Amino acid sequence: EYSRQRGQITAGGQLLAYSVATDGRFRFLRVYPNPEVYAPVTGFYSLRYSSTALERAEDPILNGSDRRLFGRRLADFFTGRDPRGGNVDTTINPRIQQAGWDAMQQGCYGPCKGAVVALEPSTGKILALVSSPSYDPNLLASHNPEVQAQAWQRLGDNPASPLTNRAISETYPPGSTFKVITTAAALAAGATETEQLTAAPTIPLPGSTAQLENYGGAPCGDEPTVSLREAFVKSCNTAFVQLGIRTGADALRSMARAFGLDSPPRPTPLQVAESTVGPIPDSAALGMTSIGQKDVALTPLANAEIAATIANGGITMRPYLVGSLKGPDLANISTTVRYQQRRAVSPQVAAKLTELMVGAEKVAQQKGAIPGVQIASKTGTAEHGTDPRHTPPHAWYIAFAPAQAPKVAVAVLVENGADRLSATGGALAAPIGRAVIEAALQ
Ligand SMILES: *C(=O)[C@@H](NC(=O)Cc1ccccc1)[C@@H]1N[C@@H](C(=O)O)C(C)(C)S1
């Protein structure tokens, strides 16, 4: 294996993983020049612990044993020249990836836990895939057995779990980002932006003693009722609870399926955890589901796709991480074909969601806003866990830009909201999302 030069993983004409000839018993050492930043993409290639992410998924291409490559390897052996693996050109934009990483390291009064996903809505290209904290795959590329095992042990016991790709492997309550799905369900059912909903600071749940309140216990406005548009841009809870229950369990399940939930995701070639709306066993649950709580659980990737789908006029592009596979001579072996996965909503519903989202962006805290770029977004702050009231919530932000003709869609998850009980998506996640947007549009 190691007597032969393994091929490269690339992004934007830059190397993410390469192999270097050494005096080692195993000649070739695998090197990762920007290790923690790209670990979610590259994975690691280890003597002791095998391969992960694209090292693994694209292993036959990279080691030159792929059937489409094997002729070249045979000509190399016969001819006498040194064998070389093939190349994997990813869809990652290094400027967008770096910006997502940097902003997550800086944006929680110190480093954030969580993920950043950037997508090109019209193609499905995964432009960034950041998880935090990360780890150094060079540690596991070491040819020393004790260096690998010590690093493995350390990473394994680290309760922050830096090995986890939080972008695609983990699911979290979306909280109020899911108001996008509730609203879409409502609109498809014939509800309008002018629909009058409760402004009440609190709402009881049917068939339970529990109550759901607005953030800070404040009424949505000073009038008895507000328009759906106004409830959405202010992100008032009781209105969406009322709306969700009005719209009903079947329509919401249905709309969630339409946006890719409760369907097994296609590999990118990396496997993506399945997102869900939950069973919604009763109307108490429906009310909670409506604001992205109860059993709703999404990957940051799925939440970025929701944004991307709206950005694409209601058509979900199949998301993918590999743009092309190449020979060691860089002859084309495989170019990825972009694919329309399904239509989630009519262009008209997508246009109305875009309108609502632009409004919710103007309302949200304004840190990191880019002069002359119109952003559509939805913030969220999701309670979680066995002691949710005493546990810091996740700060979420999904968005796309420019709102009129989108070039990028993002999701930002700040898991546990910088260890603050008063964490919000607008305060933590939104400026991270905006910096990624700015990097993508530069
Ligand atoms: C959606 O995320 C809502 N979040 C809060 O209600 C947190 C919460 C508290 C108790 C139970 C369940 C959830 C609203 N949306 C966010 C947001 O837009 O970021 C607000 C903080 C504005 S409240």
What are the Cα distances from residue 403, in Å, to 188, 328, 346, 383? 21, 41, 17, 29
Q: In what order do the strands lie in the sheet with 126-132?
A: 126-132, 114-119, 408-414, 394-401, 376-382
What are the Cα distances from residue 372, in Å, to 40, 137, 233, 408? 32, 40, 20, 16
Is the CB of residue 59 below 6 angstroms from any atom belonging to ligand 1?
no
Q: How far apart are CA 226 and CA 232, in angstroms?
A: 10
Nearest CA to ligand 1 atom 3: 176
Whole-number CA gyration radius for the chain: 23
Long-range contacts of 258-262 (CB under 8 A, 24+ apart): 258/342, 258/343, 258/344, 258/345, 259/181, 259/184, 259/305, 259/306, 259/309, 259/316, 259/344, 260/302, 260/305, 260/306, 260/309, 260/316, 260/341, 260/342, 260/344, 261/298, 261/302
* Run of H or E residues at 377: strand 376-382
Nearest CA to ligand 1 atom 23: 215
Q: Hey, where are the domains in the chain?
A: 1-90+136-158+321-335, 91-132+171-320+339-442
What are the Cα distances from residue 139, in Å, to 41, 135, 147, 157, 192? 16, 9, 7, 16, 55
* Catalytic-residue membership of 131: no
What are the Cα distances from residue 370, in Å, to 192, 326, 361, 401, 438? 30, 38, 12, 11, 7
Is the CB of residue 134 below 6 angstroms from any atom belonging to ligand 1?
no
Nearest CA to ligand 1 atom 16: 380
Is the CB of residue 383 below 6 angstroms from any atom belonging to ligand 1?
yes
Query: Which architecture does CATH list for 1-90+136-158+321-335?
Result: Alpha-Beta Complex (3.90)
Per DSSP, the three-state class of 151 is: helix
Structure's resolution in angstroms = 2.3
Is the CB of residue 262 below 6 angstroms from any atom belonging to ligand 1?
no
Is the CB of residue 291 below 6 angstroms from any atom belonging to ligand 1?
yes
Nearest CA to ligand 1 atom 4: 381
CA of 379 to the centre of ligand 1 (A): 9
> What fold characterizes domain 91-132+171-320+339-442?
Beta-lactamase (3.40.710)
Identical topology for domains 1-90+136-158+321-335 and 91-132+171-320+339-442: no
Q: What are phi and psi of 95, to 5 degrees?
A: -70, -40
* Annotated catalytic residue within 176, 235, 275, 377: 176
Give the rounded distance of the alpha carbon of 97 from its chain centre. Answer: 12
Q: Which of 368, 416, 409 is nearest to 395 (CA)?
A: 416
